[PDB]
Amino acid sequence: AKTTQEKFDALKEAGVFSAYPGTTDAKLGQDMTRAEFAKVLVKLFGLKEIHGQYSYKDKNYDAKNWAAPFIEAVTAEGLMQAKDLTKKIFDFNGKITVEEASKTLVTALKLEPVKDAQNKATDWAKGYFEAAVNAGLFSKDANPKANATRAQLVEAAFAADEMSKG
Ligand SMILES: CO[C@@H]1O[C@@H]2CO[C@](C)(C(=O)O)O[C@H]2[C@H](O)[C@@H]1NC(C)=O
């Protein structure tokens, strides 16, 4: 049974995960931005980067933003969307939460959100989070509302990859 560090090392060699920005450290206890996680999803699921399209109005979300091709890909794929459909705000620099990551992976894996889900998650996410817990993507005592640690994201990505091979 691989450790989180072993899983990270496998995913890093595969080009799916990177070290913590500006370092060579895995920093498994640190958090991850929504921008960085969009890139993880693109690499994990083999999505095509989308250049020259901008679906959001966040300040400094434009052609100079390195993450736009990744964010656009996960948007086109239906994995991520805005937090605010009026102002069209993705919150690219906000940290990805456990329940947000759960939605992306449940969606990519074509798992059914759980009806009548009763758990700690924000209302919109209860079904997604429950499906992710039931599939072993996050541990049962993970806080859906917390920022996901890099460890948790490695564990979840690794399990998603295992579920995508066949
Ligand atoms: C606060 O609104 C929620 O925002 C969530 C942000 O995280 C993800 C995973 C996303 O699509 O990026 O899920 C979003 C939720 O669907 C929800 N957004 C909307 C428009 O209902």
Author numbering: 28 to 193
Q: What did the paper state?
A:
Prokaryotic cell envelopes often include proteinaceous surface (S-) layers composed of self-assembling subunits in porous two-dimensional crystalline lattices. S-layer anchoring is best characterized for Gram-positive bacteria, where S-layer proteins non-covalently attach to the PG layer via species- and strain-specific non-classical secondary cell wall polymers (SCWPs). SpaA possesses three consecutive SLH domains near its N-terminus, followed by a large C-terminal region presumed to harbor the self-assembling domain(s). The crystal structures and binding analyses presented here of P. alvei SpaASLH, SpaASLH/G109A, and SpaASLH/G46A/G109A with synthetic SCWP fragments provide novel insights into the functional contributions of many conserved SLH domain residues, including SLH-Trp13, SLH-Gly29, and SLH-Arg43, which precisely interlock from three different SLH domains to generate two active binding sites.
To demonstrate conclusively the significance of the conserved SLH-Gly29 and the backbone flip for SCWP binding, we created a double mutant SpaASLH/G46A/G109A for binding and structural analysis. As expected, this mutant displays no detectable binding to 4,6-Pyr-β-d-ManNAcOMe by ITC. The crystal structure of SpaASLH/G46A/G109A displays the same groove conformations as wt SpaASLH and unliganded SpaASLH/G109A, with G2 narrower than G1. Residues 46–55 in G1 are in a similar conformation as in the unliganded SpaASLH/G109A structure, but with a slight widening of the loop to accommodate the Gly46Ala mutation. Despite the lack of binding detected by ITC, ligand is again observed bound in the G2 pocket, albeit with Gln108 and Ala109 in the unliganded backbone conformation (i.e., not flipped). The monosaccharide is bound with the same interactions as observed for wt SpaASLH, except that there is no hydrogen bond between the pyruvyl carboxyl oxygen and Gly109 nitrogen, but instead there is a minor movement of ligand away from the Gln108 carbonyl that results in a less ideal bidentate interaction with Arg61. The observation of bound ligand in the crystal structure despite no binding being detected by ITC, similar to the observation of 2:1 binding in the wt SpaASLH crystal structure despite 1:1 binding measured by ITC, indicates again that affinity is markedly increased in the crystal context.
